[PDB]
């Protein structure tokens, strides 16, 4: 317990541009204590150096799991256990559920299915000369591919994003209170409707069949904790990669018109993004289960640690010129996905969604341009992005 | 116990080029029973998936540590226990006491010196017209490198080459051991020399200070054994990379003359290197500790699982046209370093040693050449690399 720079007291200039601050810091440090901003500003150790976020992602001696300690977070009333909040032997076996899923093979056969789904969005879009890309593009494939995976597509979306949104930027502490009990319902509701149809030859379909045998593979409340973030964490992440692609792009027009040029460049620029403006900007809950250190620094135990997983993909140690965005850039190991046992299981989808997204919207739109300025950004620590991006071709 | 694919069928062609079996294996699926080339021909489940590989590094239910299951290889009991044949929390502890020292901040301190070295070498070299590469360059400066680091101030280099090689690539039973034992004597003798010597702030001088402290924080079975690793996994690896570095843009005339016609391109195209040519080839001892799964397959409790590093690096599914060496190739996750809690200590330091070396070499050998056969490949599936590599400038 000592010196706390507050994070609130950069203002809005801190959430728009989280960056030179990340950078001020890393010149005195690796790991620093930090008062998160507002709402519901919370304090731990955030990691902002690139080999210290990758070495605390493998640290055996940080757990996800506060039941160890005697809290209980909502998520985890609510929802249930799900991947993020489990350590190994739980973590194993529930992951082991889902891994076949994801593979680059079975998520290259989606290929065809993201393809039409993008065809039709931009159709849609297209002939109205101008839009938000997120309303009329960036959120809805996203949404439409991660509910035909599943599979229930008859999904009320609205609902189904409004609540999503608010459990990943919390606006305080009611409206959060009262969204996860909503979409715990919502997902109660959601998968007995699932296990009265009958022969669901689908992910979810399986994950039920396996919950009502009578082994542990399954409990129901981690049922619906896997849909949770099944459902979840599909969404916002690539909503976000797909619009801070675009945007990014628009406001680096020496490169845009570098890849239009050659569209060879298109994934490596994808890459670039994700180095860049990483849609997660810092990574989910960890605490230290026992006494350790991570700089030079004495980590106690309980103390949480944050990993600043965009505020890696600035160190110049790893990442030369940070603060530029280059599509030719040396090949860059990022943390966009994190490292280790937590590795994103979207990782391929993610990058499959995107650059199809990407490409046909490039091919599609030749005067794509902003027009002008992006909306809101979301609060709290967890999401790099902007809700609307007005855009115009 | 199953089918084997028995490597040692395939003849000198494998151990010259793997890659087209490799191919062929990760076209079935990405992992497989197999019987290691001879000598000592060993049988285990190879992983030859980048997906998997990754997975595999990271799984929680994988130990390096034999003892727990009764059986003690010539490495552990006669050098003692290290980073690679523990688990956490022995693992956790060891690497604690190095992790500072093989930082980004402070090998980068390092860049004038390791110049400093690799110009000594090239102005002593270069006169003479031709040479062999890895006695004149490639295999002086990672020696010199990491002694001084340690630092072990004046080492016998034709001795410890000979034993480090053969406990990297055993010839056969009786060498091995043997090799061992006489490092395991040179190191003990090495280490005494600095114990009777004025105490300087360096390495092993931290060393064993904490030996003498003892409260099992380092025992001095756990000290000959780090100074073991560091010596030898410092010096094979890196001299290989160099090799491997300069035969592959040599035998790829295109390539090099892009990077002669642009050195901004030397990281990109090191980074290659590591992928197509990794010095390691296949990770070190994981076995099984309880029953699971890799891609679907079944490993049963104590069975040995190799992950294949190179494997991955070919793999179409990560790299698209793996078998092209791509100076130019965008957005390219290799495993040439492992991953997970394991992941290399000493990468920074290999990566600042090779692009040095390289550098210097290209810009004062602007006719450099094959010339002409190269030198035999150790066996075994630690190393990718041959041992003499004759060239003329
Ligand atoms: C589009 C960009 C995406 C990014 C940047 C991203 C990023 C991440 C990151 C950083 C983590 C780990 C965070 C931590 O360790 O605390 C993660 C985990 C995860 N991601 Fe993603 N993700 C993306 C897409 C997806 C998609 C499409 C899905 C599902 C369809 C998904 C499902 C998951 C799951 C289930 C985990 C938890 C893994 C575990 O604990 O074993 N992600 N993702
Ligand atoms: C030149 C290229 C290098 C490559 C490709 C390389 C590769 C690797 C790999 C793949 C591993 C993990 C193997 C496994 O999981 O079984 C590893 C571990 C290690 N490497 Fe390297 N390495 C290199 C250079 C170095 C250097 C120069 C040093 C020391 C100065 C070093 C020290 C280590 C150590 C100490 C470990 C063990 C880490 C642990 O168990 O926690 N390496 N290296
Ligand atoms: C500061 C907000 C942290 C809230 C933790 C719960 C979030 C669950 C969704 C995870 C999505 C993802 O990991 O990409
Ligand atoms: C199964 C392989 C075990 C080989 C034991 C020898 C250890 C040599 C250390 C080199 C480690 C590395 O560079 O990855």
Known sequence: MGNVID???????????????????????????????????????????????????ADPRLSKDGTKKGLTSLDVELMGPYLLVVDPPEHTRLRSLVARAFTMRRVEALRPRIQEITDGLLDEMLPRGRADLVDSFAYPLPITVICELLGVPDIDRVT???????????????????????????????????????????????????????????????????????????????????????????????????????????????????????????????????????????????????IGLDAAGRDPARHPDPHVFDIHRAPQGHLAFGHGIHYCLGAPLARLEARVALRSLLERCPDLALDGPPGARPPGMLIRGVRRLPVRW
Chains 1, 2 share one sequence.
Not at 31 to 53: D, N
């Open 7 to 57: 994070l609130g007291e950069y203002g809005a200039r801190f959430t728009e541009d989280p960056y030179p601050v990340y950078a001020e810091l890393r010149e005195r440090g690796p790991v620093h204590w930090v008062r998160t901003p507002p709402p519901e500003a919370f304090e731990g150790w955030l990691v902002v150096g690139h080999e210290e976020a990758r070495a605390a992602l």
């Open 160 to 306: 189904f994003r409004a609540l999503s949104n608010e459990i990943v930027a919390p606006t305080g502490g009611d409206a959060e209170l009262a969204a996860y009990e909503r979409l715990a319902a919502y997902l109660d509701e959601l998968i007995d409707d699932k296990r009265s149809t009958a022969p669901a030859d689908d992910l979810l379909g399986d994950l039920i069949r396996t919950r009502a045998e009578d082994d542990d593979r399954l409990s129901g409340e981690e049922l619906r904790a896997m849909a949770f973030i099944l459902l979840v964490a599909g969404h916002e992440t690539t909503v976000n990669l797909i619009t801070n692609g675009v945007h990014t792009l628009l406001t680096h027009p020496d490169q845009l018109a570098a890849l239009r040029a050659d569209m060879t460049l298109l994934d490596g620029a994808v890459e670039e993004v994700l180095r860049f403006e990483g849609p997660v900007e810092t990574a989910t809950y960890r605490y230290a289960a026992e006494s350790m250190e991570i700089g030079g620094t004495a980590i106690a135990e309980g103390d949480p640690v944050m």
